[PDB]
Amino acid sequence: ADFESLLLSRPVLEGLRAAGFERPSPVQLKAIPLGRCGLDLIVQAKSGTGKTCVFSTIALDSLVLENLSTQILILAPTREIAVQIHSVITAIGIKMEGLECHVFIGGTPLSQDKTRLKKCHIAVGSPGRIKQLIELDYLNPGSIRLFILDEADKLLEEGSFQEQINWIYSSLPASKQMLAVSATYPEFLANALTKYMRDPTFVRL
Numbered sequence: 001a002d003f004e005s006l007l008l009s010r011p012v013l014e015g016l017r018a019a020g021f022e023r024p025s026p027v028q029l030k031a032i033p034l035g036r037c038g039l040d041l042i043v044q045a046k047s048g049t050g051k052t053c054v055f056s057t058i059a060l061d062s063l064v065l066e067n068l069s070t071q072i073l074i075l076a077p078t079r080e081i082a083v084q085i086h087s088v089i090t091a092i093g094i095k096m097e098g099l100e101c102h103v104f105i106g107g108t109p110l111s112q113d114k115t116r117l118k119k120c121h122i123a124v125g126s127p128g129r130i131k132q133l134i135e136l137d138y139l140n141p142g143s144i145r146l147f148i149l150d151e152a153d154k155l156l157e158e159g160s161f162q163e164q165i166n167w168i169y170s171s172l173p174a175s176k177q178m179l180a181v182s183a184t185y186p187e188f189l190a191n192a193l194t195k196y197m198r199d200p201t202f203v204r205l
């Protein structure tokens with residue numbers, strides 16, 4: 001089956017092909033329609049199966065491009081992974097004129113993040129910086145409808161970002177979709193995600 005059978009919009013289809021993604025991987029076949037349906041997803045599959053591309057594709061297909069507002073928030077456990085996500089979104093979104101996707105990490109002045117957030121469809125960042133930006137109302141979360149956790153195991157493990165993610169989650173609108181993707185699903189992650197997803201759909205190979 002091809003990407004067309006997944007009912008993606010033409011700009012996303014064209015972007016996928018331009019970015020070198022000719023046919024969906026098994027996890028993409030399963031997860032993309034469920035993502036388009038608006039369901040909360042837990043996608044658990046090993047590294048390299050295509051999970052980053054899954055959520056990036058669901059995200060881009062969901063965007064109202066003509067509304068220059070932050071509709072999608074994506075968290076990553078490291079600065080490098082935040083940038084990797086940005087690279088994937090920018091590649092697949094290459095046919096979407098005026099797409100604004102930006103990375104929010106430590107080391108840039110907050111005043112510059114403030115300016116960048118005035119033109120930002122998709123915010124990608126680390127939990128600490130994103131929390132700070134929401135607290136300052138530099139990122140007003142009122143237009144966010146899709147909240148994505150990449151490497152959710154690493155995000156929510158002991159000594160990581162559960163407190164900040166709980167806080168961010170609570171700041172978001174009541175009505176929203178969440179996606180969590182992870183290589184593993186240990187008890188701590190199963191338990192943590194009950195805070196955010198009432199009755200998630202699981203996607204596994």
Ligand SMILES: Nc1ncnc2c1ncn2[C@@H]1O[C@H](COP(=O)(O)OP(=O)(O)O)[C@@H](O)[C@H]1O
Nearest residue numbers: 021022023024025046047048049050051052053
């Ligand atoms: N449909 C596809 N066709 C070809 N290559 C793909 C496809 N989806 C992902 N890839 C590539 O496979 C690798 C792993 O994808 P990624 O989305 O990073 O997986 P994960 O997040 O599960 O580790 C990357 O190099 C990515 O560019």
